[PDB]
Amino acid sequence: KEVCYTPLGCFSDDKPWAGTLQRPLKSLPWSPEEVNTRFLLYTNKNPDSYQLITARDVATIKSSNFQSSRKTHFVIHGFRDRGEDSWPSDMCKKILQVETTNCISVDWSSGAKAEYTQAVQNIRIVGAETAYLIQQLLTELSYNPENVHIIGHSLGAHTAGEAGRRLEGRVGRVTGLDPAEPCFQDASEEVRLDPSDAQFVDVIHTDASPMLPSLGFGMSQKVGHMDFFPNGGKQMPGCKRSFIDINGIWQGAQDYLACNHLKSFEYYSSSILNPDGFLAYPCDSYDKFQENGCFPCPAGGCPKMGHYADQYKEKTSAVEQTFFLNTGESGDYTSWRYRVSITLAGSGKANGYLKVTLRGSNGNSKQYEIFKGSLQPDSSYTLDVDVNFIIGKIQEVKFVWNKTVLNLSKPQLGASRITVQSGADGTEYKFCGSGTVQDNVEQSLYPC
Ligand SMILES: CCCCCCCCCC[N+](C)(C)[O-]
Ligand SMILES: CCCCCCCCCC[N+](C)(C)[O-]
Ligand SMILES: [Ca+2]
Ligand SMILES: [Ca+2]
Numbered sequence: 438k439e440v441c442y443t444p445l446g447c448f449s450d451d452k453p454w455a456g457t458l459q460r461p462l463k464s465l466p467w468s469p470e471e472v473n474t475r476f477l478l479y480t481n482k483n484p485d486s487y488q489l490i491t492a493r494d495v496a497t498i499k500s501s502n503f504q505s506s507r508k509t510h511f512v513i514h515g516f517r518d519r520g521e522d523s524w525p526s527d528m529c530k531k532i533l534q535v536e537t538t539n540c541i542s543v544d545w546s547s548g549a550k551a552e553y554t555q556a557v558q559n560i561r562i563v564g565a566e567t568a569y570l571i572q573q574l575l576t577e578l579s580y581n582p583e584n585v586h587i588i589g590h591s592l593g594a595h596t597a598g599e600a601g602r603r604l605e606g607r608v609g610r611v612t613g614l615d616p617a618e619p620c621f622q623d624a625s626e627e628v629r630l631d632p633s634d635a636q637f638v639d640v641i642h643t644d645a646s647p648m649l650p651s652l653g654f655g656m657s658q659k660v661g662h663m664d665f666f667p668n669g670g671k672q673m674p675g676c677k678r679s680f681i682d683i684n685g686i687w688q689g690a691q692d693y694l695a696c697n698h699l700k701s702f703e704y705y706s707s708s709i710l711n712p713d714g715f716l717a718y719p720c721d722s723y724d725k726f727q728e729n730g731c732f733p734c735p736a737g738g739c740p741k742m743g744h745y746a747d748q749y750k751e752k753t754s755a756v757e758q759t760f761f762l763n764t765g766e767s768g769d770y771t772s773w774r775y776r777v778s779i780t781l782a783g784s785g786k787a788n789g790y791l792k793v794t795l796r797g798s799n800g801n802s803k804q805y806e807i808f809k810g811s812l813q814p815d816s817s818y819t820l821d822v823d824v825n826f827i828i829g830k831i832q833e834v835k836f837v838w839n840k841t842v843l844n845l846s847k848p849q850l851g852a853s854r855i856t857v858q859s860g861a862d863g864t865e866y867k868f869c870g871s872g873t874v875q876d877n878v879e880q881s882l883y884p885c
Contacts, residue, residue, distance in 0.1 A: 440465055443493075445565035453625035454561070460620050460628075466558040472548030474566040477520055478503060479529040479540045487526070487542070492570035495577055505578040508586060509539040511567060511600075515591030515617060516556050517680045520544020524702055528588070531709045532744070543567055549592065557620045560592055564599025571604060583609040583636060586747075590614040590702045591654065595621055598630025598638070598660075606633050610747060613640040615655040615701035618648040622656050631660050632756045639663045639746045641705060642670035644697040652679040654698040659757035663749070665742045667715070667764050669723035673700040674766040700764075707769045708743020713827075714771030715742040716860065717760030726761040729821045732776055733860040765825040773827065777807050778819040778856035782873050785848025787812040788841035793855075794879075798829025809841065812850060819856070831857045831866045836880045849875045855882050 439449040448454070448466050455463040466472075477487035482502040490497045503509075510532055512525040520526060520542040529540035543566075548559040567587070574580035585608045589597030594613035601611045613630050621629040632638045640661035646653025653671065672678055676696035683690035708715050716739035720731035733739075740749035742762060751758075764770040779791060790809050795802035807820045834855060851873025857866040868882035 438463070438465070442469055442562075444569060445469065445562065448558075448561055453628050454558070457624060457628075459622070459624040460554075460557065462554065464555060464558055466560075466562045467548055467551065467555065469562055469566065472545055472559050472562050472566075474548065474563050475520065475544045476566075476570060477526065477542045477544060479526070479533060479542070480504060481533050481537045484530055484533050490541075490570075492566070492573050495573065498574075498577070503539050503574075504537075505574070505580050507538045508536070508584050509541065509574070509580075511541050511543055511585065511587040511597070513543040513563065513567070513587065513589040513593035513596045514545070514549065515589070515593040515596070516549055516553060518549060518590070518593075519546035521546070524706065528702070528706045528709070531706055535709060543593075543596075553619065556592060560596045561599060563596050564603060567596070568600040568603035571600065571608065582607040585609055587611040587635070588614065588705070589616075589630075591617045591698060594640075595628075595630045598634040601630075601634030601638075602627070606635060608635045610637040610639070611635040612705070612746070613638065613661060614705055615641060615643045615645075615698055616660060618645075618654055618656045622648070622658050629660065632662050632753075637662055637747060637753055639665070639752075641665050641667065641701045641742065643667060643673050643699075643701040643704070645670045646672075646679070646697075652694065654695070655701070659759060662753045662756055663717075663740065663746060663758045663760065665717050665746075665760050665762070666723055667700070667704060667742070667762055669727070669761065671697075673697045674764060675770075676700065700770075704764055704770055705743050707771065708741065708745065711769055711771050712741045712743065712745040713861075714769065715762060715764065716740070716774070717742045717762045718774075718860070719758065720761050721759075723761050729776065729819060731761070732774070732821055733858065733863050739861065763823045765823075771827070772823040772825050774821060774823055774860035775831075776819060776821050776856070776858035776860070777805070778817060778854070778858075778867075779807055780817040780853050781812055781814055781850065782853040783812075783814050783848050783850040785846040785850075786814075787845070787848060787850060790839045790841070791818065792837040792839070794835035794837075795824070795828060795831055796833030796835075797831055799827060802826075802828065804837070815853060830864075832868070832884050834868065834882055836870075836878065836882065838876065840876070847875065849873050851880060852882065
């Protein structure tokens with residue numbers, strides 16, 4: 438029970454578009470007009486106001502600052518979001534401070550203001566609007582599709598994968614910023630987003646808890662050549678866990694219930710200006726990562742999660758290549774990972790915290806509990822940690838340690854050695870603290 442439209446063609450309401458386990462009711466997309474898809478063009482020439490372009494009137498493009506010479510970034514929002522002044526436009530601007538390029542924000546606000554179930558269908562339209570606009574950068578200005586990068590959030594991610602599929606995977610890259618779960622997880626690839634929709638698909642997963650009984654709006658399913666899982670991808674730091682601004686029904690609700698879903702475009706937008714800020718590490722599971730595994734960055738380097746992911750040598754050597762890492766709690770959310778070993782010393786057996794600080798070069802870190810437990814002489818005790826900022830080179834630690842069981846002597850403990858290390862490369866820095874002062878000191882171990 439299909440319906441056709443302008444140059445965009447037809448939309449069959451039957452499987453897998455509807456009457457799926459994933460999409461139980463049968464509906465059809467709105468009209469192009471009803472959706473009001475709008476391509477807004479930013480280029481280094483005009484980094485503030487945009488140029489309304491249209492694939493319907495080629496004149497609007499040719500007479501615009503669009504540069505057939507350069508890459509083109511598309512940024513598509515999702516359910517109940519907008520292009521005009523929300524984050525997508527904000528994101529285009531950031532992209533133009535670092536590369537000379539065309540960045541378009543795909544605003545379909547009015548169509549994404551529908552009821553989720555409908556919205557899940559309007560997405561098909563915007564796919565086509567977009568795909569179509571690309572089919573006419575090729576025909577009109579011989580603009581190679583493999584120069585196009587589509588970046589979509591939530592429903593937008595699937596939107597982008599849609600356009601991508603309309604162009605037989607000719608499009609060079611689509612990036613999925615926490616692709617929506619409801620109606621997509623475990624569905625035909627025809628309807629969702631999968632590695633086949635572009636030459637390169639990379640995904641950031643920030644809200645991959647189960648949508649049902651549980652409300653994790655993000656897909657847990659791997660759908661890219663690369664699927665990144667910041668902080669394990671289920672609970673992002675800075676957020677406390679779990680549309681018409683619910684904030685007018687229940688004050689705080691929106692933010693509360695969407696914060697993790699949104700960290701996907703947060704992290705990405707910051708990677709644009711901070712490439713070295715989000716290095717993913719390959720691993721089987723986040724726990725292996727969290728339990729001091731898969732460290733440090735591998736042979737060639739860690740992929741940069743985010744904007745500069747397309748620089749990874751083996752970016753498409755496989756599908757569902759998964760990586761893990763930890764972001765910051767706020768600001769630009771950049772964290773760097775270091776390994777920290779401590780082998781014990783002394784005579785008497787104690788119990789306690791095993792804190793640490795860092796001076797590096799740039800600033801100084803925070804306290805860093807590397808261990809709590811039994812402190813038997815000359816053993817060893819490592820733990821990987823996350824430095825929410827860019828320091829430099831260690832060789833300037835501090836130590837400190839506190840009590841858990843109160844007495845059995847009060848021994849002269851210290852720390853024989855403290856193997857430091859970077860994640861990026863492998864730069865150890867390790868130190869000798871010959872002089873095992875008892876308790877609660879800033880015994881500054883130093884180079885050797
Ligand atoms: C799978 C549906 C995702 C629901 C999340 C909706 C988030 C609202 C968009 C955020 N905001 C309008 C502030 O950009
Ligand atoms: C306690 C401060 C954080 C706000 C918590 C708001 C949670 C309300 C959940 C929204 N809902 C419509 C399900 O009530
Ligand atoms: Ca697909
Ligand atoms: Ca790039």
